[PDB]
Design an enzyme around this catalytic site. Sequence first.
Site, PDB file in Angstrom:
ATOM      1  N   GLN A 176       0.774  -1.241   0.000  1.00  0.00           N
ATOM      2  CA  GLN A 176       0.000   0.000   0.000  1.00  0.00           C
ATOM      3  C   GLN A 176       0.798   1.279   0.000  1.00  0.00           C
ATOM      4  O   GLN A 176       0.226   2.329  -0.358  1.00  0.00           O
ATOM      5  CB  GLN A 176      -0.943   0.041   1.190  1.00  0.00           C
ATOM      6  CG  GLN A 176      -2.027  -1.058   1.104  1.00  0.00           C
ATOM      7  CD  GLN A 176      -2.937  -0.934   2.257  1.00  0.00           C
ATOM      8  OE1 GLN A 176      -2.686  -1.531   3.338  1.00  0.00           O
ATOM      9  NE2 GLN A 176      -4.026  -0.137   2.074  1.00  0.00           N
ATOM     10  N   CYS A 204     -10.745   0.131   3.552  1.00  0.00           N
ATOM     11  CA  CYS A 204      -9.350  -0.002   3.174  1.00  0.00           C
ATOM     12  C   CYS A 204      -8.837   1.383   2.824  1.00  0.00           C
ATOM     13  O   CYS A 204      -9.505   2.126   2.051  1.00  0.00           O
ATOM     14  CB  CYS A 204      -9.236  -0.878   1.943  1.00  0.00           C
ATOM     15  SG  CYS A 204      -7.542  -1.138   1.339  1.00  0.00           S
ATOM     16  N   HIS A 228      -7.144  -9.494   5.714  1.00  0.00           N
ATOM     17  CA  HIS A 228      -7.174  -8.366   4.780  1.00  0.00           C
ATOM     18  C   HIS A 228      -5.763  -7.895   4.456  1.00  0.00           C
ATOM     19  O   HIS A 228      -5.453  -7.655   3.285  1.00  0.00           O
ATOM     20  CB  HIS A 228      -7.948  -7.241   5.470  1.00  0.00           C
ATOM     21  CG  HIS A 228      -8.039  -5.961   4.716  1.00  0.00           C
ATOM     22  ND1 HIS A 228      -9.238  -5.465   4.255  1.00  0.00           N
ATOM     23  CD2 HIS A 228      -7.090  -5.061   4.369  1.00  0.00           C
ATOM     24  CE1 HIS A 228      -9.012  -4.304   3.633  1.00  0.00           C
ATOM     25  NE2 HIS A 228      -7.728  -4.007   3.671  1.00  0.00           N
ATOM     26  N   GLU A 229      -4.907  -7.763   5.474  1.00  0.00           N
ATOM     27  CA  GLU A 229      -3.564  -7.260   5.200  1.00  0.00           C
ATOM     28  C   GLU A 229      -2.708  -8.301   4.454  1.00  0.00           C
ATOM     29  O   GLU A 229      -1.861  -7.927   3.611  1.00  0.00           O
ATOM     30  CB  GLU A 229      -2.837  -6.787   6.495  1.00  0.00           C
ATOM     31  CG  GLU A 229      -3.619  -5.659   7.283  1.00  0.00           C
ATOM     32  CD  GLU A 229      -3.995  -4.500   6.452  1.00  0.00           C
ATOM     33  OE1 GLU A 229      -3.297  -4.222   5.477  1.00  0.00           O
ATOM     34  OE2 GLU A 229      -5.035  -3.842   6.743  1.00  0.00           O
ATOM     35  N   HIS A 287      -3.273  -8.034   0.816  1.00  0.00           N
ATOM     36  CA  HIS A 287      -2.568  -6.955   0.142  1.00  0.00           C
ATOM     37  C   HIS A 287      -1.206  -7.398  -0.394  1.00  0.00           C
ATOM     38  O   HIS A 287      -0.820  -6.961  -1.505  1.00  0.00           O
ATOM     39  CB  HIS A 287      -2.331  -5.753   1.064  1.00  0.00           C
ATOM     40  CG  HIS A 287      -3.486  -4.812   1.125  1.00  0.00           C
ATOM     41  ND1 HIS A 287      -4.015  -4.167   0.023  1.00  0.00           N
ATOM     42  CD2 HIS A 287      -4.215  -4.387   2.189  1.00  0.00           C
ATOM     43  CE1 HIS A 287      -5.025  -3.357   0.439  1.00  0.00           C
ATOM     44  NE2 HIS A 287      -5.188  -3.448   1.746  1.00  0.00           N
TER      45      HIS A 287
HETATM   46 ZN    ZN Z   1      -6.563  -2.507   2.831  1.00  0.00          ZN
END
Ligand code: ZN
Length: 164
Positions: free
Chosen positions: A50, A90, A132-133, A136
């Site tokens: 991210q 997010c 969720h992470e 990524h």
């Molecule tokens: Zn996210």
Amino acid sequence: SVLQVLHIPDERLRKVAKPVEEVNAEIQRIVDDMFETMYAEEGIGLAATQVDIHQRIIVIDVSENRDERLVLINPELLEKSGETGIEEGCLSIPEQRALVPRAEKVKIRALDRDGKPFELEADGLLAICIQHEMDHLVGKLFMDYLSPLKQQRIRQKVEKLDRL
Ligand SMILES: [Zn+2]
């Protein structure tokens, strides 16, 4: 230092992170900058992908008091069970939230900020955030669990949001 968080559409968010070679000062600096960024952006998790850093580094804090720092370097999923879902948000998909299927409990192993291995059994909000992470790091976003139509609407809303 607060780093810039990538927003869709951005192909850099779809990159697969490489494992961290060694947890040295440079990696610790990235971890600290990620936490500073995560708190400044008012988030509960952030993956290095991210912030355009393609290594397997995640920072998380799901605590009420904002004082429970969790660092997952090269995390590995060891076990999972059950199913659950909440409407997730997010930082890379601003102001958009949607229910996504997740395991209810997960057990992972990773290195901490000192490069020390550790194991963690998580459930609830933390298990969801961890999943969720981790997604990524392999270039997967929560909108990917949604229908093509819904992804289209999400992209249109984000693009229009970043125009303002
Ligand atoms: Zn996210």
